[PDB]
Each structure stands twice: as C-alpha cells, then as structure tokens.
Homo-oligomer: A and B are copies of this chain.
Amino acid sequence: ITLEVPARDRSYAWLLSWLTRHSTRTQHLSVETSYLQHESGRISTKFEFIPSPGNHFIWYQGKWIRVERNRDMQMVDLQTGTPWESVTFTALGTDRKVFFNILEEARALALQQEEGKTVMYTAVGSEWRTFGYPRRRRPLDSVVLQQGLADRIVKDIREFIDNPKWYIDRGIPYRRGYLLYGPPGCGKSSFITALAGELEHSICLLSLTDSSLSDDRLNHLLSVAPQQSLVLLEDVDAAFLIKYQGLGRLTFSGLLNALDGVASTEARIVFMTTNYIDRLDPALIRPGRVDLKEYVGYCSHWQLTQMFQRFYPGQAPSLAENFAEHVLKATSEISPAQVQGYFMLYKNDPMGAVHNIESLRP
C-alpha cells in the first residue's frame, strides 16, 4: 500500500506546513512558540500546533490517509544534531499519483505563503534551512546611490536572468558574480536587500569564517542552493591575508575552485561585499568569478538632495538644494548614514534641519 518517508532533507518544511494547514482535526499536537512581525513593528508571540509522535489521520480528497511521526530518537551525529525526525504518509491504495499530487500542493502553498516578503536562508551543516521568519521588503526607491548605479546593476542582472539560451549556444557557464566595495556606511548591504526584494529573489547567507566549513562542504553547499536565490559573502577579505585566518578547515584554492572551477553549478548569482579592495587577491576578483565591480562611496550633491526629498516629502526643491549645498560646504566627506542620523534627530522639522547644519563639522 502507498507509503512515503520524507527522510528529513530539503522537503520536511513544506510537508510540515501542509500538515498544519489542511488538517484542523489533528491530535497529538505540539507547541511551537515564535515571534510574529505584525504591521507597525509591534511584534507578538505566536503559537503553531505541529505534529508529535503517534498516529495522526487526515481526510483529504479521495481516500482516508494515515500520517505519522516516527521519532525513535537515536541521534549520535551532526547530520541533524537533534532527533532524526522522520515522517510517514500512508494509505490503502496502490495508485501513487495522488501522493505526488498532495506533495506538489504542499510545495505550491509553501511558495505562496511568502507573497510580498523576503526569505533568508542559512547554512545548517551542509544544507540550507529557513532562518527566522519572512522579513519586510525594503523598497528600492529608499536606497539612494550615485547617479546611475542602481539602474545599471539592476539592468545587468535582469539581462542575465532573461537570456539563458545565449549562454548555452556558446558553451559559457551560466554563472555571474558581483562585487560591491567602498567605505563604511555607504549602502552595500541595504542595496543588496533592496535588489533581492525587487527581483522576487531570496537570500542565502554564507559565513566563510565558520568552524564547520571544509572545502568539500562548501563545494556541496553552493551546488544545492535554492532556486531563484542570491548567495552572499559578507567581508570576504577578512578570511584570507593566500592563508586562512579563521576557525575552520577552509583553504584559498578550495574557495576559488568552488566559485568557478570544474564542478561548479549553473544558474547561480553570488554577491560579495568588502570595505578594503587592496587586500583581495587578483585571482578572486578577475573576470569569470566577478564580472562587475562597483564603488559605493561617499555622498555627493545629488545624493543629499534626493535623501532630503525622501525624508521630508512635501517641500520645495529650493530647500533641499540649500541643505545639500550647506552640508557639502561644511564637511568634505560625509556618508549617507551620518545624514540619516542627523535627520533622525529632527523628525518632521525641515527648517530645523536646514538651520542646524553646523553640528556636522567634526
């Protein structure tokens, strides 16, 4: 008779979600307490009732079905670092089309739960797991970069995603990589978040300086990356000097051969972020691994004008021009974050913002 055993690998989440959502008559429940991010930032705790071992029964269209958890917890391993957490579906039939159907429905509901939000994955051992809960999509119009830099990057990445046949009919690998660099507090990580929210993509964070990251495990992680997901390497310069400086068993050649080597996977987009670009070996930022280097730097006239128009909507452009001129006359280099803080002091008080410029001259 029909029987299915998920095995707890890159599928467990979706089936748990469906189990909770559809049944509504189940017993042997549990308590999963977590945070929920309501509108207006006022978080509140929330309970999800999820299975616990013993026999659970569900009536979905057609025949009765018996689902179950078989957690005979012998877990001497890091493969889960928790009980093995099997699951079981079964039913008194021998036409296994309906089981395939229910699982695909679970996939559909899972991918539909995140409609206007941004998932963040993370590395658990050598697999990708959800991390926390869906975040709020930071709009892309609220990250003011230099004149004609966000449009360039967005256009290039869109062109990359909507021309896969041009890469195959010439034998090139279907990969790409980007590198944002510049001083501290200038718009790298925020732009990455906004870009991920504009392309309906997700994010997958990867911390090289981590105690459980061998070259083989890294080569396996980037190959099993979720579909339609940006991978991200934050501060890749702090990992190497052509010599490792972190806790772990990762080398330089392993990284260089995992990004672009002989057994690298297709349809992958990697971002890197660094503050200092002189400490990066030229064998890691050459074309093939990193096809677009961009410098997100200190503010200029246009940036300050646009930031002023963002914070105080409903003012004449003359006031914004006055602000930009005064600030850029006062101090030579000023990052957008300092300007953000300065506006954070004067909420809904544009005149006071234009009057108290002299507090920025360090």
Contacts and interface: CB of A to CB of B under 8 A. Distances in A.
A249 to B, nearest CB: 4
A295 interface: no
A135 B267 CA distance: 13
A96 B256 CA distance: 50
Contacts of A29: 2-5, 96
Contact of A184 (B100, B172, B174, B282): B282
A203 interface: yes
B41 A311 contact: no
Given A164-B42, A227-B43, A261 B234 contact: yes
A353 interface: no
Interface string A282-304: 11001110010000000000000
Q: Which of A35, A164, A192, A223 has the most CB of B within 10 A?
A: A35
Nearest to A54: B3
Given A11-B33, A185-B288, A275 B265 contact: no
B283 A184 contact: yes
A45 to B, nearest CB: 7
Interface string A27-39: 1111111010101
Contact of A238 (B7, B37, B253): B253
Nearest to A42: B164
A189 to B, nearest CB: 5
A214 B39 CA distance: 32
Nearest to A87: B31
B163 A347 contact: yes
A16 interface: no
Contacts of A35: 224, 227
A207 interface: yes
Contact of A261 (B74, B189, B249, B335): B189
Nearest to A31: B6
A282 B362 CA distance: 15
A263 B132 contact: yes
B82 A82 contact: no
A170 interface: yes
Contact of A166 (B25, B96, B347): B347
B47 A100 contact: yes
A287 B338 contact: yes
Interface in A225-262: 227, 232, 234-235, 238, 242, 246-247, 249, 251-254, 256-257, 260-262
Given A4-B30, A35-B224, 13 more contacts: A3-B29, A9-B33, A11-B33, A31-B103, A76-B76, A77-B81, A120-B262, A132-B223, A170-B310, A207-B215, A209-B253, A234-B253, A238-B242
